Amino acid sequence: KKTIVWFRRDLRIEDNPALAAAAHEGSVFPVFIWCPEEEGQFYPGRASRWWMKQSLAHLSQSLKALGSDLTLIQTHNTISAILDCIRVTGPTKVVFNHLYDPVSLVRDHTVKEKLVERGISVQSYNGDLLYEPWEIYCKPFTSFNSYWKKCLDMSIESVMLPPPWRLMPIIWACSIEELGLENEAEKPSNALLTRAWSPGWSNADKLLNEFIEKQLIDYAKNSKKVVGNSTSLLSPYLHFGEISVRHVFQCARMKQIIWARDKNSEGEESADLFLRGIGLREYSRYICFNFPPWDADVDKFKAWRQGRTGYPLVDAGMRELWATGWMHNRIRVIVSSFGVKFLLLPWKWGMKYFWDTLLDADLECDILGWQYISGSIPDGHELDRLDNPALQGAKYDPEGEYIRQWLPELARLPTEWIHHPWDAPLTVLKASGVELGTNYAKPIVDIDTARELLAKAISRT
Amino acid sequence: KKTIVWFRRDLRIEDNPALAAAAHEGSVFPVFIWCPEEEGQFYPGRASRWWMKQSLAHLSQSLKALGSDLTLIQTHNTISAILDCIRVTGPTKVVFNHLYDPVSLVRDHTVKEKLVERGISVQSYNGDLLYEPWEIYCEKGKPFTSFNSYWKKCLDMSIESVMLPPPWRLMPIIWACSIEELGLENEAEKPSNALLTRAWSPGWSNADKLLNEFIEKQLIDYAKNSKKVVGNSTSLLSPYLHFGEISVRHVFQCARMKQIIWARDKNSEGEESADLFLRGIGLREYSRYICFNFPPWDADVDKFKAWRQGRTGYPLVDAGMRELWATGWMHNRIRVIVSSFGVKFLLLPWKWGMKYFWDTLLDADLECDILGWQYISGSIPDGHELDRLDNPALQGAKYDPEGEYIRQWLPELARLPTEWIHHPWDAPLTVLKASGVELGTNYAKPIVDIDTARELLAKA
Amino acid sequence: KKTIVWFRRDLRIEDNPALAAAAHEGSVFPVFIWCPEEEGQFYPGRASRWWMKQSLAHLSQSLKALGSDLTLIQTHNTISAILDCIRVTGPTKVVFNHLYDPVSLVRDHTVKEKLVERGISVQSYNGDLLYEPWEIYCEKGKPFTSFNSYWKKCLDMSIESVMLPPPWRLMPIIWACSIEELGLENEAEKPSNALLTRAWSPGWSNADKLLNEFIEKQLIDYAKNSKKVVGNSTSLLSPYLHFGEISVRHVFQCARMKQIIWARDKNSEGEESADLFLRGIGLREYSRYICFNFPPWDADVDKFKAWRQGRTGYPLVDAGMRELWATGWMHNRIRVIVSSFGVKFLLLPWKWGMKYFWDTLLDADLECDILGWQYISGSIPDGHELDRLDNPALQGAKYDPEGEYIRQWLPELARLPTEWIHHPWDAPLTVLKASGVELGTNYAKPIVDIDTARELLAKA
Amino acid sequence: KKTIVWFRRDLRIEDNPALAAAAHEGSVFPVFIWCPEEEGQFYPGRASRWWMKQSLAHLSQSLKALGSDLTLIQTHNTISAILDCIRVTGPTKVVFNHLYDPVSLVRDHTVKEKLVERGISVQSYNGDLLYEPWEIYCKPFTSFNSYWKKCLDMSIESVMLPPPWRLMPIIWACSIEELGLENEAEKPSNALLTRAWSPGWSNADKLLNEFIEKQLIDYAKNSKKVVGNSTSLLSPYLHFGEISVRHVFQCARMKQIIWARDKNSEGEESADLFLRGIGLREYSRYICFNFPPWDADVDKFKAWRQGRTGYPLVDAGMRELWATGWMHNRIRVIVSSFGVKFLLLPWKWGMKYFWDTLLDADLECDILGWQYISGSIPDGHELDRLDNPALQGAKYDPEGEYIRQWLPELARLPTEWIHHPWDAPLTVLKASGVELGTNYAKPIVDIDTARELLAKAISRT
Ligand SMILES: Cc1cc2nc3c(=O)[nH]c(=O)nc-3n(C[C@H](O)[C@H](O)[C@H](O)COP(=O)(O)OP(=O)(O)OC[C@H]3O[C@@H](n4cnc5c(N)ncnc54)[C@H](O)[C@@H]3O)c2cc1C
Ligand SMILES: Cc1cc2nc3c(=O)[nH]c(=O)nc-3n(C[C@H](O)[C@H](O)[C@H](O)COP(=O)(O)OP(=O)(O)OC[C@H]3O[C@@H](n4cnc5c(N)ncnc54)[C@H](O)[C@@H]3O)c2cc1C
Ligand SMILES: Cc1cc2nc3c(=O)[nH]c(=O)nc-3n(C[C@H](O)[C@H](O)[C@H](O)COP(=O)(O)OP(=O)(O)OC[C@H]3O[C@@H](n4cnc5c(N)ncnc54)[C@H](O)[C@@H]3O)c2cc1C
Ligand SMILES: Nc1ncnc2c1ncn2[C@@H]1O[C@H](COP(=O)(O)O)[C@@H](O)[C@H]1O
Ligand SMILES: Nc1ncnc2c1ncn2[C@@H]1O[C@H](COP(=O)(O)O)[C@@H](O)[C@H]1O
After folding, report:
1. Residues 181..200 of B with a Cβ closer than 8 Å to C: which?
2. Quick check: A68 and A27 in contact, CB under 8 A?
3. Sequence ranges of the domains in chain D
């Protein structure tokens, strides 16, 4: 009874089906295998590698306390590494968990086949979803509303597993520092992110409990204001699998049941909104499984990414992104739509910059969001219409705090004109300290002309 | 697909296996059946019926919100009621959960047999234990005999149970009555019973809220507070566990996860606290296990009355009885102390003590009660033998080092020095005059001398 | 420039006029002189001597830090001690503060005369009042006779006093002894007296800390909490004011400033609270004023003993005496209730009640004591006349609406309904059985019937 | 018994000697007289007029509640206004308080003389000092240490007065809006300062009590760090006389006595430091009573005042000044010294800009501070030596928080190089996002060349 447990993106010990199976079966030999060449162009970015290294150290200590140890292998081939581990330890079984990336599907199939050839049994489980994409049908659905209605109607077919108690212990293995996860010049700069975040599954649990117990009830109200911290902040923890989506779902549903019993309408609204947000991730993976004339201007892109456009919401969004590796949903919508519909940029550049900076860069969610904003989905905002900054501000930033915190040189403009300065008269722009051109930039491209150019490209249709 | 779900002592909706099975299968018809005559002499007491009524109302509202409704039947026969429900609704299946009381075992077997006669399928699950009593044995296939070896084996093994999410919705579907005609409460004792709401608040929605707070903020100090009887030091989960409003597997998982983190980061106090709590949890398993596997007093009435009202003369006994009658609870050391006093000092028939505890304790549970009384009475080699009586001064110095527990429940002794507060018959009359205390006039002289009772027990 | 500062009842350093004068003048020699024989029958009681000793130690450390030192003399004559200090240090002046006790007036006059004979100058100031008793009179030059008119006039007038900062440093300069040979405390009663530190903590540094917190966070609710006897509702400043560790002018200014702000911003509740507090403050002035301007019992011993131990049968009386003996304090309504009970029910000689209050109360003050006893006894037209006795049910409904005060100090009555908790001899035996209460066996039947005592008082 | 109470800079009712005297004497007629022409060039600035208007409204409500009313007169002559009030109400006496400004001294003397001519008695008191400047002598002292030692040795000769209880009531009077305190274009911009401050004597008391009860004990430690809020923030309240300096002094001294009794060395240090700070104001008024080759470059001055010099501490100081009307003592030292010793500016411009922006512009304290930094006092730092930014930062801003809060575009520079960026190599300036010239300015003048030019002007001596 010797089993090899393969770790890829499930860096936790609670509700881990493959680990629970192997540990109940017999003796275990955990392993992590890192192979840059197989990833292709889905190679993770800097903000992701930093979080991955911290989580790997946390997990290694956790395993060593229990009684076994993590082993790290950097290689050029995965089959070779698995076969070498087999030849050295004399195992019988191999177990792992499912992923739905294209590369992941191909690699899993190849491993399964080339291992069953030599008379060694393999097994895979499901650890990252509520319903598998091949389990919900009408034909596949085509709209989120019908999809989510069906999913709510059905009943879940999964149980939760307790963590293993102890592990019975049992080549070119290396150490966490020779994996080459971080460059040499960028260690002191990357170290600053510890000011806001702290990776590890022991910290994911501590965050979720506090959110559920004290902040859910106000979600329906705070979930439209971009200042402070209003949402839950669980995306980087969910991307690496340090928390269980089934766990989150159960906690939210139990709160909703109590609130609905005692007639708390605000509670019901908040819980429903949160669960709809949770279900959008399922829908993203589902659609990815079931359905597999720009201006090449460089300085425009550079100004976009540094925050010198002239529009306050865009400027503050980019300013917070580069400094904390995060930004609100409305700001994601706003900045992405600006980048495509205003400066007419190739959307690949925007996707790639988000890939390298965002602390939670996830392929399916990224693609779904960009399709939504770009108007390739009938459910959304069509490419034709551009929104008005004054209305955006009045709706989401009613008092100017978000502006005045990240752009201090605009701390004494009245709340009436703080979002569209090119409107306010020179008398007010003198009474205030603001001075366009000298200590704040005049708008990089006029709104009307860009609207006309997009009208060309649209009325062509 | 029509199923009848039977509710007896599992008044919750999370981690309820029978309910989860029926709801996933099809349409459900929940029912609660109350039958005084079958209980015998294990009929529940007043403090238990009060809690049961409040929990039943809470559960009924909870079910009605989901989309079905609880139905309450008071009868003289259980088979008749089940058959009537069958005849009226046209079901196919019956499901329930396991209990390990003698009456429960007999009734479950009879129901299973007399129902399988008529071609209706039945099913029972396990909802109240970690390991079933028939699953743990020694190398020669023999049951264990000592708690230490038993718990070592249980720790070594691995658990064979999963947890189930609550059902989402229920598809709805005789002499049914209402929560007020069950006759759970007398007529004169409603205003007096109402006062207990000052301290407790029943319901599974409240059990969850209590457990989360205990685990998050008080576990780490359990190893220290768990020997002081004043304030609130322990967890206070026994009445919630007796009625099954919380899941023992849930409690076990939470404690174990905390222990893993503390052991990783080298927190010795954390490890000690977690181990103590889990040993406490395992003692309940052991109690049910032993119950499953192994099925010259002075008839003085006024002595018993003085015992139960709190006029013995010994401060710890007096404060224990005083808090018991007023809040329906008392600490483990106080349970040990009062029980041992009642048997070894006044030589009372132990049945009376068992029965008074049965009627007053808010969490009267048969197995735990029997296990505790055996331990204190010395019928178990692991314990304190009947021969030795303990010294009040040492008891006090060990558990009540500053006299707070005494001075709160016995205020007329609020200016006796901490040195003599536990054995007043020692302090000289000069100190008993400087203090306000006056034995015989506003506090009782000891009801029986310690030495003479020790001699009589030495005879026996 | 050598001055002798005399300390009697002004144990503070802020707003001390005599000390400020001497320190600004030159070199100082502080002194405290204790003389039991001159006091007579106004000798302070045990709870007062305890507080006095703690405050004296605090003050001595405070002075030694500044740069001089307190000197303590126990003697048989005061003139002899002052003359000896003069002969040893070669001073020029003597300064002190005013008191309005009879003994104080006589002693101050004698000292002034016998010192001015020998060519040494003396001086006295005013440190304990707002207006001196000889400064307020009516249009015909007559003293007032009712509190309402008196306080209206006092409010109308304007204050004629300033506040003085504490001295910065002191330039230093017989049978002197130590704080332990003054004989302030007996030998057997040190361990028992030590327990009061559980609730109180003497010293002027603590009086300031208490006043600031009260004013900043509790004044605004005074008008509401000031009629409920449970918990802590009032300010608790009386023992600090009796020893002069805080300045009544300071208290007055703080309250008035809060009232001005609240009245500006239209806060009716704030205005009511502030007015009530200041009326309370002014009652002390009135007490000293009247004392300055106007200089057939049953001799039953066991009745008195039962009264003082708390075995009468009436819950409010029992809880009041129970809290008095244990903390040295009680609420104003409880003072009214217990005093009126003692005179109008058991027909006791009022001297005994006055003396027991004198020995137990932590703030025994002559003028306030006399004023309160006159009010309750009906020798003042403003009050409640001796004829009428109040009803316990109405008293309870008015002041203790939920029974908490009863159930905390009398735990053996913790499960009587809130309807009958104040007059148990009314509730039927069915309720007295459903509850645990049992009159005669664990709680006393009323010591004297209310109706018969009312008839006897109706005779008188 | 009719008295006229004159209000100039004592906008409180507690410990007001003139008001207490008049109210105890008889019937009162309070008055405030505003006369722009007599002020000269000591005319108050915008941030001062805003605070003055709010405090005047607060005081007017306070008086009207008591039972009299404030009367506001804007005029061209003060003698004319006083004589008109006399002719209309038929008074007997006039009372006011002392000020030590040059204009104040002249005006008070003229009023006293021209009023005593007509047989009307006048009276003045002392309301703003501990010791009058003519009361301490050795000859006058010449150094702060000896002065303060003598002042500590002596004993105070002042008592405190309770507020009056009620007032017995009794021309071109106008309203708070026709005084013309605020311009028309700058009302919406000025309104923003309410975000941080709240004027009024009822608020000054509430602030002082909280400071004394909870923050004094840490003064000796927090009093060297420029980030957050460490000091007491009482200067604007003390400038307008809404709190009593004698009150502050008594509270601090009482705390010190208790701490010294119970052997708390840190407590003693904190209390002594605070009282030395208090005494520096006395010394400033004392010296003012007893002892009555720049580059004319405009764009350099503009860059200084907008915050585009290149030096992080200067930039953050000016950025916080324009937005909240305040700055720490070390920042005042740093910015003033920079302005004189680096860009060689005429010091009058710096004095005037501070005059218009600072919320607490006070003549004596301003002059004393500028003399100290400029080296005209032997007790100080001589003009010759310029300080090193790295050492300044290590001493006062050990972690870079003050920099990263007011200059967010520098939020990922390591704490080692955050104060002197022109030192860090281009590898680190690439790993960080910072880019000199494009989104942050290269130093406006080199440190070495300015040091050489100042060495010319100094070695001339
Ligand atoms: C252009 C664009 C790009 C995006 N890129 C990403 C990305 O790389 N990674 C990513 O995880 N999300 C992405 N999103 C989705 C969304 O912006 C974030 O998931 C959201 O900010 C999560 O933050 P939160 O947990 O604090 O918010 P919460 O409101 O607390 O969200 C709770 C959880 O619900 C899920 N969720 C909520 N809304 C969405 C949504 N619209 N789409 C998918 N899942 C959702 C997430 O898992 C999230 O953790 C993108 C959206 C847009 C418009
Ligand atoms: C004479 C006597 C009578 C008892 N009668 C009862 C009874 O009727 N009902 C009852 O539930 N317990 C009984 N006990 C056990 C024990 O006194 C209580 O279980 C304990 O007070 C539970 O309170 P707690 O949850 O606050 O303490 P905790 O220390 O928090 O206990 C945690 C849990 O562990 C279990 N547990 C801990 N110690 C024991 C133990 N010695 N035996 C069994 N289970 C234990 C209980 O389920 C308890 O809820 C009795 C003990 C004695 C000596
Ligand atoms: C029978 C009887 C005896 C009393 N004996 C004393 C005594 O020995 N010493 C004593 O100080 N008070 C005495 N009082 C007055 C009153 O009971 C207490 O002053 C009051 O409890 C003070 O407590 P407090 O400061 O918490 O209440 P608060 O309401 O906060 O009182 C504030 C202050 O006002 C003064 N005050 C308020 N009410 C009265 C009053 N009726 N008479 C005089 N002063 C008042 C006290 O100085 C008190 O400190 C007696 C009253 C009665 C009826
Ligand atoms: N059909 C969809 N596809 C992708 N994203 C969506 C979709 N619907 C809503 N969202 C996201 O969820 C947010 C909800 O906004 P609203 O539709 O106003 O409730 C949107 O702003 C998007 O960020
Ligand atoms: N073998 C046992 N049987 C029954 N109860 C026990 C047993 N061991 C311990 N207990 C209970 O657990 C407590 C633990 O006490 P100690 O043995 O001192 O740790 C005892 O005081 C009993 O209440």
Report:
1. 186, 188-189, 191-192, 194-195
2. no
3. 1-129+166-197, 130-165+198-290, 291-461
